[PDB]
Amino acid sequence: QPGLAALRRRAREAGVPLAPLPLTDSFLLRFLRARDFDLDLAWRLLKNYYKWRAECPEISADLHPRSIIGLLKAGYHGVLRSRDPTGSKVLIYRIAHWDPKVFTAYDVFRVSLITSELIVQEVETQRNGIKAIFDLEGWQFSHAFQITPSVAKKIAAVLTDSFPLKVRGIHLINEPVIFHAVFSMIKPFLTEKIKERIHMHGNNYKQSLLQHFPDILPLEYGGEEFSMEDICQEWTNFIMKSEDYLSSISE
């Protein structure tokens, strides 16, 4: 593929972390595909990926699911079986199922990093990106307390140029008034392209959400074929089964 050997050589010359994550063709292609084979942009992304991991060890060091298995079992997250019409993988996060008295913002962030490291293995997802739906129903001030300026900047970094996944859309639904101050904290760090891709649906989201995700949503959101619990169980099992791959990319 165009630029693969050049990207490997740069990484080697720059002395990027020896291991884990050998510089296989499959690994490097994630970076080239995320940036449409633009070598310089792929290289910037690769360096940023390593930078972010080194700067956020609380989240990145151990990707084994044992630290967040309770959060998965609580029903916080699921991945749809089907892709959207543009081929993006679709992720669902439910704030009401995150108990901030038990899990920190770092733990919750780790869930997304685990899912992201798993789904990036799919070439269709490297090509078509992802969309994430956050159901903010139940957002509390106790969740907001966990979103410090540091965490806000880390969120903005992975959405923009620190992880090899194209964020094609972020859909916030059921956002309560009190969430505005939290989003305002993240906003200053986002690129214009990402801000343009964050949709605020509000409390009457059904029609608008279905327009973006026809025929693939769970029953809870207007879908008609399966439930959120079905997808949360299916994804949690897959994460559990992937514990050793996650171990191999852990440190």
Ligand SMILES: Cc1c(C)c2c(c(C)c1O)CC[C@@](C)(CCC[C@H](C)CCC[C@H](C)CCCC(C)C)O2
């Ligand atoms: C690679 C990748 C990661 C790692 C990722 C996300 C996406 C789309 C990615 O492609 C979205 C979620 C996020 C940024 C982790 C968020 C963790 C926090 C603690 C969740 C609750 C608070 C948020 C204020 C809720 C809305 C977030 C959106 C503005 C993304 O992690």
